[PDB]
């Protein structure tokens, strides 16, 4: 359960990221692919080289789903329903991979938001990504 301060903290972070959201999402995915090679098997048909328009294109979708989650923080289950359906059901995405990308998403923010990434914000951001991840692995049936 996200506290009101976590909501305030996550809101601020998104605020600062601004129009870079799409770009930071691609970087997180690249950070993941390089750091946790096993995650690459879900994108066999993607070119995962640096500068890959498919990766950049995908980071935008990722960043947008996260912004929607933020814009609807008190009902992420509802907002993220179609996405969690897609991730568990069709893609069969091992739950552990959510922790890998969430960490890479944290690393990306940290690398771009010096003043923002305080211990507290880092804690709030961590809880938000875990909530998004819980929802995303919720349809495992």
């Amino acid at each position: 359960v996200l506290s009101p301060a976590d909501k305030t903290n996550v809101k601020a972070a998104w605020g600062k990221v601004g129009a870079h959201a799409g770009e930071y999402g691609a970087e997180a995915l690249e950070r993941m692919f390089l750091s946790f090679p096993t995650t690459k098997t879900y994108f066999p048909h993607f070119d995962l080289s640096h500068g890959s328009a498919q990766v950049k294109g995908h980071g935008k979708k990722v960043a947008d789903a996260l912004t929607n989650a933020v814009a609807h923080v008190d009902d992420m289950p509802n907002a993220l329903s179609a996405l969690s359906d897609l991730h568990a059901h069709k893609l069969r995405v091992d739950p552990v991979n959510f922790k890998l990308l969430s960490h890479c998403l944290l690393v990306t923010l940290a690398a771009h938001l010096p003043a923002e990434f305080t211990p507290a914000v880092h804690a709030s951001l961590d809880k938000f990504l875990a909530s998004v991840s819980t929802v995303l692995t919720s349809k495992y049936r």
Binding site: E30, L106, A110, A123
Partner: protein, 146 residues
């Protein structure tokens, strides 16, 4: 674990730039804050009631300095982490009974700390290299469980 010459170069170049008196405390501090249950192992440390209290706590920075030291020690014996971490493993596993998952967490917190301090200099490949290292340390610290 085995790092390639490029990974070793990417790791040592950035490490040399690390403030050994501050980064360990920052990481321990953030662990205690991001994963609160960890504070359980530090009842003697005093005030940990707030993140500000945690980050400014003398004991914390002092203890984080030691932790960083062990990380440095590890960077020097990448090819022999088991031997290097033996006593810390017995301490952490046989005496403290710290669940190993927390070793991976602190390692990942370190990575976050480095990304925060170094910015764009902490490139994805520089991170991939550092992930191999914190993975290695965590594995070695946990040898007493295996």
């Amino acid at each position: 674990v085995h790092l390639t010459p490029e990974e070793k170069s990417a790791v040592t170049a950035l490490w040399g730039k690390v403030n050994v008196d501050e980064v360990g405390g920052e990481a321990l501090g953030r662990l205690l804050v991001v994963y609160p249950w960890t504070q359980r192992f530090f009842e003697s440390f005093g005030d940990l009631s707030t993140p500000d209290a945690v980050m400014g706590n003398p004991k914390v920075k002092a203890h984080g300095k030691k932790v960083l030291g062990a990380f440095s020690d590890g960077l020097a014996h990448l090819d022999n982490l088991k031997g290097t971490f033996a006593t810390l493993s017995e301490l952490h596993c046989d005496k403290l009974h710290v669940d190993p998952e927390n070793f991976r967490l602190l390692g990942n917190v370190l990575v976050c700390v480095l990304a925060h301090h170094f910015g764009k200099e902490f490139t994805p490949p520089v991170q991939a290299a550092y992930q191999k290292v914190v993975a290695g340390v965590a594995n070695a610290l946990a040898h007493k469980y295996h």
